[PDB]
Write a protein that binds this ligand. Structure first.
Ligand SMILES: O=C1NC(=O)[C@](CNC(=O)c2cnn(-c3cccc(F)c3)n2)(C2CC2)N1
Ligand SMILES: [Ca+2]
Ligand SMILES: [Ca+2]
Ligand SMILES: [Ca+2]
Ligand SMILES: [Cl-]
Ligand SMILES: [Zn+2]
Ligand SMILES: [Zn+2]
Length: 158
C-alpha cells in the first residue's frame, strides 16, 4: 500500500462526540498522534479551518462512505490509508461510548490504532501490538507501542 509523501501532516476534528468533554477529545487525539510522531519523522498539526490531511469524524450507521457502522459493539472505528480526499481520514462509531479511561471504549487507544491505518499500517498478529485486531484496554499511563508496531511504522517512514 501507499505512504504519505510528506512529513508535515495536518488533522482536523470534524465534529465532537457528546460522550466526552471537548478538551478530553482534543487531548486523546493529540496524544494519539504524538505516539506515532515519537517513532517517525512525521509531524502532526491540528488545524481549525480548510482541508486537513486527516479528518477525524464521529458518526453512526451509514455515514457517506462505503462502510456503515454497526451500532454499539463490533466495529469501533475505521480509517483510510494515505491518499487524497477520504484518504487518511479516521471515523469513530458514535454508537460506542467514548471515555477518557475504561468506562466505555477508550478514545486514545482507539485513535492510536486508527492513526496507524491512516499512516498505512495493516493489522498485526502480535497480541501486544496496538495494531492487533482485538481492542482491549491497557493502562494508558504505561502505554507504549510494541516492537512489532515500531518496526511496522519505521519500514514505511524510516
Ligand atoms: O480499524 C479497524 N480495523 C479493523 O479491522 C476494524 C475493526 N477494529 C476496530 O474497530 C478497532 C478499533 N480500535 N481497535 C483496537 C485494537 C487493538 C488495540 C487498540 F488499542 C484498538 N480495534 C474494521 C475495519 C472496521 N476497524
Ligand atoms: Ca483525507
Ligand atoms: Ca460499533
Ligand atoms: Ca456515543
Ligand atoms: Cl472512563
Ligand atoms: Zn466512515
Ligand atoms: Zn484495524
Amino acid at each position: 500500500g501507499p505512504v504519505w509523501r510528506k512529513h508535515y501532516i495536518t488533522y482536523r476534528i470534524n465534529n465532537y462526540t457528546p460522550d466526552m468533554n471537548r478538551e478530553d477529545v482534543d487531548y486523546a487525539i493529540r496524544k494519539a498522534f504524538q505516539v506515532w510522531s515519537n517513532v517517525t519523522p512525521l509531524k502532526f498539526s491540528k488545524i481549525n479551518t480548510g482541508m486537513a490531511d486527516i479528518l477525524v469524524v464521529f458518526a453512526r450507521g451509514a455515514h457517506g462512505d462505503d462502510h456503515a457502522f454497526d451500532g454499539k459493539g463490533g466495529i469501533l472505528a475505521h480509517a483510510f490509508g494515505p491518499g487524497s480526499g477520504i484518504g487518511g481520514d479516521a471515523h469513530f462509531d458514535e454508537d460506542e461510548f467514548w471515555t477518557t479511561h475504561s468506562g466505555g471504549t477508550n478514545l486514545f487507544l482507539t485513535a492510536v490504532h486508527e492513526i496507524g491505518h491512516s499512516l498505512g499500517l495493516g493489522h498485526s498478529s502480535d497480541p501486544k501490538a496496538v495494531m492487533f485486531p482485538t481492542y482491549k484496554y491497557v493502562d494508558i499511563n504505561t502505554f507504549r507501542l510494541s516492537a512489532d508496531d515500531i518496526r511496522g511504522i519505521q519500514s514505511l517512514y524510516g
